[PDB]
Symmetry: C3
Subunit: 495 residues, 3 copies
């Protein structure tokens, strides 16, 4: 009898970590840091709803394709949701110049107020009612974009238009107009009389004469004529003036840009649910508590940072071992309120006391290391949505390589960070047990025999209140030096 | 007599590694991981040949510059090889609209099938034979692009063309046409009669009237007129219709895009050899066995990852030391089938036994660390070739900075990874010898004296079959405790 | 009496470092590596001055806006300085085609030589003197760009211009011309007679007919007409020919590109001072001695690498502790010419000798580790300035994300590098003290008692010239083995 042992925590845990060196390493304690679940709904972003375009495209909405619903309330949004291939775009076929630029402008803007600038009834000298087509049904009748006017010759006359709007607002105004490209020369004259026409737009920034390009094209949504649209931002206290002799698709309404800020155009097939999140992805929303996720790269909100991994587990405690007598043979499930500690084995004692001056010293710098790790990726790359047209493949690929590029880097970074100070979290625990041992050996010197198992046997009488002298770093050799002085010469001369 | 020593491997190796701390550190074993050789040929890519354009540019090929050879067989390719400045481009001078976009389309496509769409003999109302020029010799005669037709007024008449092709194929069709820009008004009328002409193209996606731009320009390849070309992808079950009153350079043949996939347009001056590779660079092919190379950034195939370094050597074993008696003084060339081990020195023995329960435990986690390192760069940036025209410098520089950017990052990553767990591979070996020592000391306790050289001398009789008791972690103190009990009191009372 | 202790340096230092584990860790020695000061001036770059555009924009300079001063001396520059919103741009309002491309060309070019190509007095058949406007005052009179000529009908005639310049120079020539867009058809005819006009330019590379676009626009700087400018680089031994029937704004002077190289267009509000630097940022210049700075991302010259941090401090020495008797209790302010060492305590001695064979061995591999760290970021991303127009937002954001992207990566890299081998610099010092201790224990074996405080007491007579035997690794056990042999049996049998 008369012993003392130095050992470490063990427990029911089966949590597993990885390092550079080893795969699958059972530990006492560890934190998962990778979110891999989503709710598969689309939700508001911290109280603020998305604009859900339904089966409509941004052009359908902005121009007022009769099939799309205007948002009369002038709502603010958190993001914009567009199906992958919407069905309500340019119902009248044609092009929409710098369309993807306009889409990118939407991503920095959060609220529109639709404003009349040219009332549909103020073109006394032209027909403002015949401009409808079988390509734009509203309740089955022929119709047309609601926010622009197909101007057409009145009484076989087309008096040359010159008309100005002064932006007397505080806000930028987004204005859209268009031009008509007919099938053939008979169709031009039947609509706008004057055989040779133009649409001229002027601001302080933009100067543009535009000309009808007559060709013979396939029937899209039923027609061969096309309609090409343009757009501009009119700054405050600037004016715009349109002049045309035919083919001019006039704006009636402009869009006040009333709130700029963080927004997004998310391609998703889902629809709205009564639900709120801090983080939305196109295939559902995230419980943004953990620092990394792998659900989707195009997540918006206050989000965890995206890494392409299947698991990412931080180690925080010991490995896990029976495990009898001392630290060399494993850890003690019998220690509970501490990570490293002791075992009495006394004239009176049993054992299992924890050294908390190095146990909370350990839970100190690892829970301080833990969030230090989370915060140094505070600045990690978040991807941003963008679109490109069939003649901008190179930049679309440039953009794609850049975003895959950074995700790969940051995925490597995140993994190598966990793998590495996982190996140093464990290498610390070992070093912490090994140093507990040396602080008791450096006090109990002559008066004890090193058992080689991580325990010591005492050449003296110990006493319970003297084995806190060793736990407290207080044990004085002299006060029982003279009792050990004699007993050991008895072993050298025992049996 | 009566000793035992603990030591490590040493060998004839002169291989050298680096760490954060030290340069040039001789080791027993190490793996080079950086490929720096190439064969200077161009080869097929795993059975599949490159399309070698010879002295021709992609436009020369596609349009059929009489100097370039068509590929009648409709072959599939692995990559496309274009000299840096080809000599057979637009032999008739002019421009080729969105040329670099078309080049980028080639990089995702692997096979064309040339298809007639408008046979050269089906333009009854126009001259299809006079359209040749002295800028396009074939065997010294005047000639012209073979895949397009220079249509010219027949009998001083130019009846207005309107002609349609319906893509009744499964595949995308690449179609090329062009327009003619003459020197002066006399030259327009002499060719196409009608003084004012146009070329109109329509699909469901594209609408384009095109107009002859007459100017007075320098003589390129001998002429002052120019010819401007356009192109489009016609989707399946879509049609295209061309309408023109003059200056129209008609397509005869279209290109079926019959195989899309991984391809590339490699600028290289070399020519084909009878040779095959897993990895091709513009200056030669790579023996793609090692994980990194530094031959060229624009390598394609299954390739090692590119880093801008001159050397990259992983450490896998001990440093390398004579080195007499114990581990404190160096390692033992006399140990051979193991990294760490022992030395007998017995009543009967000599020495040199290896501790394999920690020697393959070491070759375990380092050859497991080795390929763990290679695989975490599985996702490292591979560069992709792109071209830009003289008015897209900014993006070309954007693209260049991005690709240099990522290479710099991944070069830093690769180096810091080797340097760092090189220092921990060695720091492991030290720790492994130092722990072998402690497992024999923790068993042979009283019955041996620590010599300070990494050896122990026995206060008892050892026995060969008891010095595997120490190698096996089986040595019991008691079975010869009583013999050492006495001998040591004899030293304290010896001479 | 009769002792010896092993300990480490301590000092007056209060310098603090960080690691992954701990914040704020006092040390003996450390190097700051982050520059955070600037002088707030703009200076020459290693003898070579900037071109300071003052209240002028690159277009104002190049075209010769009467308000901007030509640089008659043909100076070379190091960078170009442009205010954020200059006030002297196109004084005559209009556009400048591919303006941002031209700005990007300036960044690779270092010297212009202005060259006459078409003297203002060589247009016999047109008025070369009436082309001035109230939008371009020089000393209050009406004036105009000095490097281009507003050509106007002479005597109600406008003879069709055709005029050629052959670039007979070694250098690329930058040439600028323009076209005039009038208010209305009355204004066209009053200036250039011929109602329908064009401006045609031809080189071997460029073919361009250009047409006046008459519209009704707001009054910018007082006018509603606009003027649109173009530009091209004419290669050596190529020619350019302009042909026009009206509205043609002719070049008089071209710019020889006489020196290409490293340059930049820095947006800054400051002005020149008599001052020189190796590194300039828009808000001032940097003392480019340290390896990192955080002053500004758009710094040019030989510069430290930019990281977004507030501090970055390398550890190079010990932590800092009284600290009495041995290494377990702290370090000794009394050791001065060394990091680790000893303390005599002798029949004659006092103490405090330094072990320099492991002290310069330590200052060796850390000052070798220090600059190894600085050099592995030799290849770190340096940002490059670029501009984009209101219809290139997507790429501007692409460009912005790329440059923020790399800065974030390299900022993470730099921090994780310091934090990590700070922890291994300190973990080395500990290991170095702990190994000093073992080399004296492995020699003084039986003849000394381990005190547990990092000191040993001698069972023998020591001698000053024998306690360099322990510092030199020379101490032989035998020469005083027999004196200790006896004394220790006296302790076991003392009182």
């Amino acid at each position: 009898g008369d012993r003392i042992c130095i050992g470490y925590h063990a427990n029911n845990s089966t949590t597993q970590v990885d390092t550079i060196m080893e795969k699958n390493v059972t530990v006492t304690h560890a934190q998962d840091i990778l979110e891999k679940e989503h709710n598969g709904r689309l939700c508001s972003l911290k109280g603020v709803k998305p604009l859900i375009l339904k089966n409509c495209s941004v052009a359908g909405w902005l121009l007022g394709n009769p099939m799309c619903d205007e948002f009369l309330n002038a709502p603010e949004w958190s993001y914009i949701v567009e199906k992958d291939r919407p069905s309500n775009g340019l119902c009248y076929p044609g092009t929409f110049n710098y369309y993807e630029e306009l889409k990118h402008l939407m991503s920095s803007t959060n609220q529109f107020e639709k404003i009349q600038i040219f009332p549909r009834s103020s073109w006394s000298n032209h027909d403002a009612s015949s401009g409808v087509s079988s390509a734009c049904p509203y309740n089955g009748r022929s119709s047309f974009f609601r926010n622009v006017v197909w101007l057409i010759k009145k009484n076989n006359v087309y008096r040359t238009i010159t008309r100005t709007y002064n932006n007397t607002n505080i806000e930028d105004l987004l204005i859209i107009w268009g031009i008509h490209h007919p099938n053939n020369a008979a169709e031009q004259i039947k609509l706008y009389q004057n055989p040779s026409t133009y649409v001229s737009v002027g601001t302080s920034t933009l100067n543009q004469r535009s000309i009808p390009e007559i060709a013979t094209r396939p029937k899209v949504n039923g027609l061969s004529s096309r309609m090409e649209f343009f757009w501009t931002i009119l700054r405050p206290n600037d004016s715009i003036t349109f002049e045309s002799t035919g083919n001019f698709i006039a704006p009636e309404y402009a869009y006040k840009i009333v709130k700029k800020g963080d927004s997004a155009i998310m391609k998703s097939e889902l629809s709205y649910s009564n639900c709120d999140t801090k983080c939305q992805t196109p295939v559902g929303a995230i419980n943004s508590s953990m620092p990394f996720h792998n659900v989707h790269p195009f997540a918006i909100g206050e989000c965890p940072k995206y890494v392409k991994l299947k698991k990412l587990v931080l180690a925080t405690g010991l490995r896990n071992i029976g495990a009898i007598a001392g630290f060399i043979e494993g850890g003690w499930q019998g220690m509970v309120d501490g990570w490293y500690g002791y075992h009495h084995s006394n004239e009176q004692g049993s054992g299992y006391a924890a050294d908390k001056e190095s146990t909370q010293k350990a839970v100190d710098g690892i829970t301080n290391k833990v969030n230090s790790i989370i915060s140094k990726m505070n600045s990690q790359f978040e991807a941003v949505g963008k679109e490109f047209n069939n003649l901008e493949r190179r930049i679309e690929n440039l953009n794609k390589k850049m975003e895959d590029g950074f995700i790969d880097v940051w995925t490597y970074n995140a993994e190598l960070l966990v793998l590495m100070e996982n190996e140093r979290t464990l290498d610390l625990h070992d070093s912490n047990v090994k140093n507990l041992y040396d602080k008791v050996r450096r006090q109990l010197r002559d008066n004890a025999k090193e058992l080689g198992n991580g325990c010591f046997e005492f050449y003296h009488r110990c006493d319970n209140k003297c084995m806190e002298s060793v736990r407290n770093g207080t044990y004085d050799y002299p006060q029982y030096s003279e009792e050990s002085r004699l007993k050991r010469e008895e072993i050298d001369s025992g049996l």
